[PDB]
Design a protein around this nucleic acid. Structure first.
Length: 166
DNA sequence: TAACAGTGGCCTTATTAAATGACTTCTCCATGATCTAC
């Protein structure tokens, strides 16, 4: 039918950050499609058609439900409280690099406590060359990326906004 | 008017090439929930 969200690298109004964002969405969608082969499994029957330089999203029912499902599945938190982006191959990456990525995101994007709720300071002692070194990182319980779906959709009609979002 | 215009041997031997301590101090935050006044 008609895609509800269409994104292209050839759009003339996009900057570098916009294109990097479409690339991240493309990687996340590839990983999700590997995780959820059937569109019925995905909330709202959300389905996508990915090309070399275009992203199109189709879904049924309320826009808020489908967007919330996609965003919640895209941005996750593991048991330890680290940022778990399903766009990246998290099983293949080790714990130290995951901690590095989480700390970088928390120090660059989530600079402000207004956009994350901090948990306890989790300490882990991983042995290295017959020596156990204690990594101490700030675990999280929520960050704005998880619940931006509310800002993407209208409060009452629960549909995609037709205006600009600040 | 001439024939010479120095023949030698050396051209530094030692020793030490830095010892200290300092390697910026402050401040200017951004953003949303809430208080509050109109």
């Amino acid at each position: 039918t008609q895609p509800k969200i269409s994104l292209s690298l050839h759009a003339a109004d996009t900057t570098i950050m916009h294109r990097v964002g479409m690339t991240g969405l493309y990687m996340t969608l590839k990983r999700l499609e590997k995780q959820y082969p059937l569109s019925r499994q995905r909330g709202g029957h959300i389905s996508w058609f990915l090309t070399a330089d275009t992203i199109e999203l189709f879904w049924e029912g309320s826009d808020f439900i489908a967007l919330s499902w996609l965003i919640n599945e895209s941005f996750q938190l593991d048991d330890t409280g680290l940022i778990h982006l399903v766009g990246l191959d998290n099983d293949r990456i080790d714990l130290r690099q995951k901690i590095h990525i989480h700390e970088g995101i928390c120090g660059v994007f989530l600079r402000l406590n207004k956009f994350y709720q901090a948990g306890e300071i989790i300490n882990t002692e991983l042995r290295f060359e017959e020596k156990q070194v204690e990594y101490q990182y700030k675990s999280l319980t929520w960050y704005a990326h998880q619940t931006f779906a509310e800002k993407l959709c209208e409060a009452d009609t629960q549909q995609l906004r037709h205006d600009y979002i600040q």
